Amino acid sequence: DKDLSTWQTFRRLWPTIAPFKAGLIVAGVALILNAASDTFMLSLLKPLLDDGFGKTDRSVLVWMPLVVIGLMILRGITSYVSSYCISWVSGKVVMTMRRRLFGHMMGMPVSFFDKQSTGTLLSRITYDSEQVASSSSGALITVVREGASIIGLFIMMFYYSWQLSIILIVLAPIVSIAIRVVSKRFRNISKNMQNTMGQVTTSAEQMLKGHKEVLIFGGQEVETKRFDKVSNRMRLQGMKMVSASSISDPIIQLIASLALAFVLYAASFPSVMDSLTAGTITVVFSSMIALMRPLKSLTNVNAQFQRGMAACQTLFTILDSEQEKDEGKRVIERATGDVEFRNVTFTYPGRDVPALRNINLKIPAGKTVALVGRSGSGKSTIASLITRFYDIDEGEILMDHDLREYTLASLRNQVALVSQNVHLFNDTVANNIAYARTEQYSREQIEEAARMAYAMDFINKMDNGLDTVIGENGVLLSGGQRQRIAIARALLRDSPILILDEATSALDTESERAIQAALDELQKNRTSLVIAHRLSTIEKADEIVVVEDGVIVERGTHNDLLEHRGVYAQLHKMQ
Amino acid sequence: LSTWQTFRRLWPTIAPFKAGLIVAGVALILNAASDTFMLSLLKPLLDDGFGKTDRSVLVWMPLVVIGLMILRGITSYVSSYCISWVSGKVVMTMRRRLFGHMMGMPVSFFDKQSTGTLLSRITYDSEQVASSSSGALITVVREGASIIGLFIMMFYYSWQLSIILIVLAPIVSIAIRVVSKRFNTMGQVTTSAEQMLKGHKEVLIFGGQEVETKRFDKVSNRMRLQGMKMVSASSISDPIIQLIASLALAFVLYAASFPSVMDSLTAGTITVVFSSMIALMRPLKSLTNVNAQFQRGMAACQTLFTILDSEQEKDEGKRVIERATGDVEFRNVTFTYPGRDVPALRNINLKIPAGKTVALVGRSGSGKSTIASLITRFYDIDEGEILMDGHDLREYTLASLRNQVALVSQNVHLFNDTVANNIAYARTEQYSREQIEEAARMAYAMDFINKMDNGLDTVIGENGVLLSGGQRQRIAIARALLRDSPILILDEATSALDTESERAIQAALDELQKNRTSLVIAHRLSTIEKADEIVVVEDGVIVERGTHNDLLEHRGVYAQLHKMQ
Ligand SMILES: Cc1c(/C=C/C(=O)O)ccc2ccc(O[C@@H](C)c3c(Cl)ccc(F)c3Cl)cc12
Numbered sequence A: 001d002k003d004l005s006t007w008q009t010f011r012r013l014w015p016t017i018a019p020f021k022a023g024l025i026v027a028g029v030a031l032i033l034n035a036a037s038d039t040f041m042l043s044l045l046k047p048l049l050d051d052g053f054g055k056t057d058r059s060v061l062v063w064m065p066l067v068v069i070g071l072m073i074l075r076g077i078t079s080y081v082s083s084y085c086i087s088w089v090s091g092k093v094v095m096t097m098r099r100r101l102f103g104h105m106m107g108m109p110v111s112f113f114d115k116q117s118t119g120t121l122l123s124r125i126t127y128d129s130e131q132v133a134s135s136s137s138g139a140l141i142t143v144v145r146e147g148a149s150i151i152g153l154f155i156m157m158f159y160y161s162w163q164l165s166i167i168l169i170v171l172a173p174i175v176s177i178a179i180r181v182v183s184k185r186f187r188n189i190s191k192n193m194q195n196t197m198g199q200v201t202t203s204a205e206q207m208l209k210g211h212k213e214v215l216i217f218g219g220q221e222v223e224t225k226r227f228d229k230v231s232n233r234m235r236l237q238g239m240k241m242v243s244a245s246s247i248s249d250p251i252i253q254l255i256a257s258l259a260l261a262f263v264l265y266a267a268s269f270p271s272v273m274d275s276l277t278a279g280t281i282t283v284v285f286s287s288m289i290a291l292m293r294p295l296k297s298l299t300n301v302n303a304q305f306q307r308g309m310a311a312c313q314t315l316f317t318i319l320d321s322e323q324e325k326d327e328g329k330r331v332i333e334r335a336t337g338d339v340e341f342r343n344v345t346f347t348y349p350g351r352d353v354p355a356l357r358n359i360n361l362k363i364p365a366g367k368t369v370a371l372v373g374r375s376g377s378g379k380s381t382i383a384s385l386i387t388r389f390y391d392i393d394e395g396e397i398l399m400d401h402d403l404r405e406y407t408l409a410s411l412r413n414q415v416a417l418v419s420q421n422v423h424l425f426n427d428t429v430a431n432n433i434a435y436a437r438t439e440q441y442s443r444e445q446i447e448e449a450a451r452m453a454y455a456m457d458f459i460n461k462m463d464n465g466l467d468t469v470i471g472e473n474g475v476l477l478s479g480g481q482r483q484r485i486a487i488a489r490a491l492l493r494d495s496p497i498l499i500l501d502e503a504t505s506a507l508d509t510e511s512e513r514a515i516q517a518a519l520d521e522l523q524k525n526r527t528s529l530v531i532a533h534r535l536s537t538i539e540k541a542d543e544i545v546v547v548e549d550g551v552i553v554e555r556g557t558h559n560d561l562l563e564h565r566g567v568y569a570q571l572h573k574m575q
Numbered sequence B: 001l002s003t004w005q006t007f008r009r010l011w012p013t014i015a016p017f018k019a020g021l022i023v024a025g026v027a028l029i030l031n032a033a034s035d036t037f038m039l040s041l042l043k044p045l046l047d048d049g050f051g052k053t054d055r056s057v058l059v060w061m062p063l064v065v066i067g068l069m070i071l072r073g074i075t076s077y078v079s080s081y082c083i084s085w086v087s088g089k090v091v092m093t094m095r096r097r098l099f100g101h102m103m104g105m106p107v108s109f110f111d112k113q114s115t116g117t118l119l120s121r122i123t124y125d126s127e128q129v130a131s132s133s134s135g136a137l138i139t140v141v142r143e144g145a146s147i148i149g150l151f152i153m154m155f156y157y158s159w160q161l162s163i164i165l166i167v168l169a170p171i172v173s174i175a176i177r178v179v180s181k182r183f184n185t186m187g188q189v190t191t192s193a194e195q196m197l198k199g200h201k202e203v204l205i206f207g208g209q210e211v212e213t214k215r216f217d218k219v220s221n222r223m224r225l226q227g228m229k230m231v232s233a234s235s236i237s238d239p240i241i242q243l244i245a246s247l248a249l250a251f252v253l254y255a256a257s258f259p260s261v262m263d264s265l266t267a268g269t270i271t272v273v274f275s276s277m278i279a280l281m282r283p284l285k286s287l288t289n290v291n292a293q294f295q296r297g298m299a300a301c302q303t304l305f306t307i308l309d310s311e312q313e314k315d316e317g318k319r320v321i322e323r324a325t326g327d328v329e330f331r332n333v334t335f336t337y338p339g340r341d342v343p344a345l346r347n348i349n350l351k352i353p354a355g356k357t358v359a360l361v362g363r364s365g366s367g368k369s370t371i372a373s374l375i376t377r378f379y380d381i382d383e384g385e386i387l388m389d390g391h392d393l394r395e396y397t398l399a400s401l402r403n404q405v406a407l408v409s410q411n412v413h414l415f416n417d418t419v420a421n422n423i424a425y426a427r428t429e430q431y432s433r434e435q436i437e438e439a440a441r442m443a444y445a446m447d448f449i450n451k452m453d454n455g456l457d458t459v460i461g462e463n464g465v466l467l468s469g470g471q472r473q474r475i476a477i478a479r480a481l482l483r484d485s486p487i488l489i490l491d492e493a494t495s496a497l498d499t500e501s502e503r504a505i506q507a508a509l510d511e512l513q514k515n516r517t518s519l520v521i522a523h524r525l526s527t528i529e530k531a532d533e534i535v536v537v538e539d540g541v542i543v544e545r546g547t548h549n550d551l552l553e554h555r556g557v558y559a560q561l562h563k564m565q
C-alpha cells in the first residue's frame, strides 16, 4: 500500500524537482567519487603490509603519505560539493512548494479561513515543505553514496580473495532475515511516546492558559494529580523508547559478528589461506567491516523516504482543495452601482438556519440605504454576499447581471469596504492608503485622499508623519483612526459601491464630527450599503430597512417610518 | 562561575539517583576497554596468524571477538538503561516542580511571558538540561577512558611514532581552532504568510494577490539564501579538519619509513598503532565540544531556576467563608497595573448588594474588566478597600474567597476531559450525575450535547477541538450553575454574540443571574436593560450611574454608548 502511495506522491513532486536536475546529477557524481575515496583508501593497506613490510621502504616513504593526503582532499571536495548541490536543490524545491501553497491558500474560499486557525496552516507549510526536502535529500544521498560503496567493497572483496567473499554472501540472506526480525520486534515505537508527550503538553498548556479558572474553581489538586500521572507515563515511554534500541543494536551487531567469525574460522583452513597473504586478509576483512555501515544505511531508506512523501501528501491535499469558484468571464470598468437582491436566501456553511430568506431589496446608483435591525441578524450577511465571499443558495444578486456572471476580480474592484476592523498591513501610511496601487496613484493624490478623510490630524502627529510605518499589527492606530484610513482608501480608489459597517465602528471618538464629515463627503457620489448605527447616516439615508431573523419587515424613510411609527419607531424608542 | 553554581543548585535534584550514574560509569569504562582490546587483537591476527600460525586465526580471534562483542553489547545496554532511568526521573521531578510552581504564581507572572514560553520551560528546557548533562557525563567518562586506553597501546607498540604524533598535537589543536572559529528571514516568512491570511478579506478586495505574491517571492527567496549559507559554512569546516588530521598522520607514516623506526614495526604493530590513532579522532572531537553542551544545558537550567526562584502569589489571609450571600463593596479603591504608572482605576466606589446583578458598561479598553479581576484578587490594590460581607478581601484565604466567585466567559478554557467532568470541574465527586445533567439542560447546552456521539460522557478531545465558541459559553454557564456560587462574574466582552442559538444563551443567563449577586462586564442589550444597576466607567473613574427611572435618561455618557452598540 504505502510504497505505492509514496511513489505516486513522488511522481507528483518530480515536476517541481526536475528543473534542478543538473544540481542533482552533479551531487550524485560527487558522492560516487566520495565513496571511491574510501574504497581506494582501504585498498592502500595491502601494499603497506606486503611490500612496505616485505622489505621495501619506497612504499611507506615516498608516495603512501602523498596518496593519502590527496585522497583526503578529494573526499573533502566531493563532500563539500555534494553537500552544496543538495542544499541548493532543497532550498529551491522548498521555496517553490511554499510559493505554491501561499498562492493557493490566498485564492481559497473565505469559509476555509473562518473555520481553520491561521496558525495550523502557517506552521504546516513551513515545517512540512522543509521535511519533504530533508527526508528526500537524505534518502537520495544514502542510495547513491552507500550503494556505490557497497559495490566498490563487494568487487574489492572478490578480487582480493574471491573465496572468502562467497562465504559472506551465502550467510547474507539468513543474517538479513535475523537482523530484520530483531529490528521489527523492538524498534518501531516512536508514536507511543508522541502520544504520551502530547498528553504532557496538553495538561501543561491547559493549566498555563486556563490559569484563571483553575484559581477561581479550585482545581489545583485535579490538575496537579493529572500532571503527576501523565509526566510519569511520559518518563516510562522515554525509557521504553531507549530500551527498544538499547536492546536491538547490540543484538544486531552480534548477529553480524557471528557471520564474520564464521568467515574467519574458514580463514584458518588450508585450501584458501595458502594463496592469500597477510596484506590481503587485512583489506578483505576491513572491506567487510566497512560494509556494515552502508548496509545499515540502505535498509532504512524506505523509512526515510516514505516519511518524506507522507509529509508531501499533506501539502498536496491542501493544494488539491477547491479554490473559490470563479467563472464569471464578464469584466466591468467602473460599474454604475445598481445593486438588487431578488429572492435571495442563504445559509452559512454547516449551519441549518438560513441567515437570510426571500430577501428582496433594491439599491439604485448614487444613493444610500441603511440596514438597521436586531444585532446578530443577517444585515452583516447581506454585506458579505455582495463581495462573493459566500455564494447564495437561491435567488440572484444583480450588479447593473448576476454577481456570479462577473469575474471575482472585476466584481471586487467595484466594492469598497469601510469598517473599523480593516486590516492595517505593516507598511507606510501612504502605502496602506494605496494598498495594491502604489504605482497608479501619485503622492499628491494620496495626500488629498488622507486630507479629505479628516485623518491628517493624527497623521501629522506621527513620528515621520505620513511616511511613518503603521502596522506591527496595528498597535499604533486606534479604531477611530482606522475608520478614517479606510475612508482614505475608498476616497482614493473612488469605487462605485460602498459597504459601510458602523456596527463595529466606535462613535466614542474625540473626533467623530470629522468622521461624520468624511462619510458625508465619501457617499455623495455613489451607491452605499450601510449596516447603520449612527444618528447621522440614518438621518441622511435615502431608505431604511429593518431586518430581523434574516427578513426585511419594514422599508421606508426615517421620517415616513416615524409617521408610520411601527417597528421602526419601536427601534427608535429602544435606541 | 555561574555555569557551575547552577549545576550545584541542580545536583540536589539528581543526588537521589547517583546510584544509577556510577553503574553507568563503570559500564562506559568497560565499553571503551572492549573497543580497545579488539584493536589490540589486531596485531596477533596479522603477525602470528601469518607468522605461519593458523592456531591464532582459528582459536584466538574467532572466539575472542565474539566474547568481546557480547561484553560490549551488554555494557552498552546497561549504561543506556541507567542513564535513561536517571534522566527520566530528573525531567519528571523538574517538570512536576515547574508545573506546580508556575500554577502557584500570580497573574502578573503570566502577563509578562507567553504561555508557550512557559510551556517550553516544561516540555523542552527541562528535557534539554538532562540531555546535555547526560551527554556530558558520557563523553567525559567513555571517551576519556578510550583516549587513555588508546594512547597506552600507541606508545607501547611503538614509542617512536607515538611521540612523533604527540609533538604534532599542539599545532594541530591551534589549527583546528582557527578554522572551527570560521565555522530574521524565518520571522519574515511566518509574518508575510500570517498577515496575508489575516488580511485575506482585504487581499481579495483591492486585488492584492499580485503584490502579496511578489512580497512572498522576495521573503521566501531571501530565507532560502540564508538557509543555504548556514549549511555551506557548516559543510566546509569538517573537510578541512579531516585534511589537517590526515596531514599529521601521513607525516607520521613518512616517519615509519626511516629504518630506525620500520625495524621496530611489524605488519601488526603499525596496523594497530595507526588503527588506534584513527580511533582517537572521535574521542578528541567529542571531548573538545563537551563543555559547550554542558554550558548550554546549565543555561537552560538557570532559566528554570529563575522561574523557580520567582515568588508565588501571597495568601496570608486567615479568614474562611463557607458561603457569602452578601454584597461586594469598593471603598475608594485605586489601582495601577504593575509596570504601568497611570492607574487603571482611580478613586472608585461601587456596591453590588447581595442577590442583585450590577451591570457595568465601559469602553472596550477601559478598566471595566479590571474591576471583576480585582474582586477575585488576581491582583492586590494600592489604595482603598474591597469588602466582601464587610470584610477586606485580603482578610480571607484565597481558596475560600474564590469559592464564592464563579466565572462565565466564552473563552473559559475547557480542559481535555468529559463534558460532564468539565461541568463539575474540580468537584467531580461532589455532585451526582443527576445534578450535572440538570445543570446541563438548565443551560440549554443539551440541544447540542445529545448530538455528540456519547453525549455527556463524550470527551473534549485534542485540546478542545470539538466545541464551538457559543457552545463553550453554555458549558461555562452550566459549570457556574451547578457549583451555585454566590457571586457571579459574567464576562461578555469575549462572548462572540452572533451565534446559531443566542436566545438559548440569553435565557440561560436569565436563569443564572436570578436571585444571585452578579457583576457583568456587559455588552448585550438584554442583560443590560434587565439589570439592577447600570454603572459607566470612563478611563479610571465612574462617570454616572442609573437604575430604571434613570435608565430612561443618564446625565453622562450612556446615550452615545448605548447608541454605538
Ligand atoms: C550488518 C547488516 C546490517 C546492519 C544493521 C545495523 O547495523 O543496524 C543491515 C543489513 C545487512 C544485510 C545483510 C548482511 O549480511 C551479512 C552476511 C554481511 C554482509 Cl553481506 C557484508 C558484510 C558484513 F559484515 C555482514 Cl555481517 C548484513 C547486514
Ligand SMILES: Cc1c(/C=C/C(=O)O)ccc2ccc(O[C@@H](C)c3c(Cl)ccc(F)c3Cl)cc12
Pocket (backbone or CB within 6 Å): B165, B166, B168, B169, B170, B172, B173, B176, B238, B241, B242, B245, B246, B248, B249, B276, B277, B278, B279, B280, B281, B284, B285, B288
Ligand atoms: C582530530 C582532532 C579533533 C577532531 C576534530 C573534528 O573532527 O572536528 C579535535 C582535536 C584534536 C587535537 C589534536 C589532534 O592531534 C592529532 C595529531 C591526533 C592525535 Cl593527538 C591522536 C590521534 C589522532 F588520530 C590524531 Cl589525528 C587531533 C584532533
